[PDB]
Amino acid sequence: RSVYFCGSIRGGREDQALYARIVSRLRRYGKVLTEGDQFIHEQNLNWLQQADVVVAEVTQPSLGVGYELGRAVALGKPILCLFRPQSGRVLSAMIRGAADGSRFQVWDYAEGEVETMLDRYFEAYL
Amino acid sequence: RRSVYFCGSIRGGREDQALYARIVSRLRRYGKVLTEHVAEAAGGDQFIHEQNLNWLQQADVVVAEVTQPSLGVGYELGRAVALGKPILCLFRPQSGRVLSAMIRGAADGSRFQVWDYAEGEVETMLDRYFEAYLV
Numbered sequence A: 001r002s003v004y005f006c007g008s009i010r011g012g013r014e015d016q017a018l019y020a021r022i023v024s025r026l027r028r029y030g031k032v033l034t035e036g037d038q039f040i041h042e043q044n045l046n047w048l049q050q051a052d053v054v055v056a057e058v059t060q061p062s063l064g065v066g067y068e069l070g071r072a073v074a075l076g077k078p079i080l081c082l083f084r085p086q087s088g089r090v091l092s093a094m095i096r097g098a099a100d101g102s103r104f105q106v107w108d109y110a111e112g113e114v115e116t117m118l119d120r121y122f123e124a125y126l
Numbered sequence B: 001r002r003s004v005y006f007c008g009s010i011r012g013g014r015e016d017q018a019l020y021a022r023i024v025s026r027l028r029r030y031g032k033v034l035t036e037h038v039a040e041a042a043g044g045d046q047f048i049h050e051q052n053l054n055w056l057q058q059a060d061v062v063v064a065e066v067t068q069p070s071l072g073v074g075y076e077l078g079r080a081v082a083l084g085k086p087i088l089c090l091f092r093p094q095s096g097r098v099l100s101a102m103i104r105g106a107a108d109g110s111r112f113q114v115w116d117y118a119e120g121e122v123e124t125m126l127d128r129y130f131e132a133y134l135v
């Protein structure tokens, strides 16, 4: 399996710690592909096109993460978004509202059980 | 007349709210602005997504002010690219921040354009774009 991971970079780097934890756990389930700007865009689109599953941490607002998710939906890749409501933020209606059965899932989580949540997704929801 | 889809941060932050209202007002000169809302129960967000995607499908051109990072705006732009819609992104360097590489890196001739501009000059930039590519 090939996994494409999305997380804020230029939107802000604050959840770096958990992105690392998420990428580490994702390795158990497949090859994590994402572990000038035109070059970056083309590189990432190529990885997105070849991915079997897309996973995004969507707590920090980010144009690039949103864009990856939009491209991924249209490519028909199954998507898991992970959101932390304890931060006090409310998730974009365009992401929450993109939920679509097995094709697009948005899961709220508490930071301490992110690994448990990923296990559950790959075991029973994919 | 032509239809314009306008994108700008909401849950990403409303720092540029007044600017978005200026943009929507100026865009009305060139067509019907489908998304004036840019200028609730979570269980209603799928309704919003559906409504917005229907509008995005109808749109002749997609205009985004991308200075404020936003998942929704990014998603709108990704969906728009895949639908083949012409796109203008407007960004303010004086914000101090580096625009997402996925947005700047998406530039593609006249089809996807990213325009840096100075605070105060959004109306003249909109006019120049519409005059050149839509009128």
Ligand SMILES: O=P(O)(O)OC[C@H]1O[C@@H](n2cnc3c(NC4CCCC4)ncnc32)[C@H](O)[C@@H]1O
Residues within 6 Å of the ligand: A005, A006, A007, A008, A009, A010, A011, A012, A034, A040, A044, A062, A063, A064, A065, A068, B099, B100, B101, B102
């Ligand atoms: O940069 P933001 O927050 O807009 O968008 C982040 C998302 O968009 C992709 N991305 C953005 N910039 C990237 C990038 N270049 C950055 C530019 C210098 C530090 C790295 N390299 C790889 N992927 C990138 C990532 O896969 C990430 O999931």
Ligand SMILES: O=P(O)(O)OC[C@H]1O[C@@H](n2cnc3c(NC4CCCC4)ncnc32)[C@H](O)[C@@H]1O
Residues within 6 Å of the ligand: A091, A092, A093, A094, B006, B007, B008, B009, B010, B011, B012, B013, B035, B037, B038, B040, B048, B052, B070, B071, B072, B073, B076
């Ligand atoms: O809320 P973020 O910043 O992720 O996304 C904003 C973008 O996504 C669309 N959008 C997001 N929330 C919307 C919304 N209502 C939400 C529910 C109450 C306020 C926000 N109504 C219409 N469009 C919305 C807008 O067209 C806008 O361009």
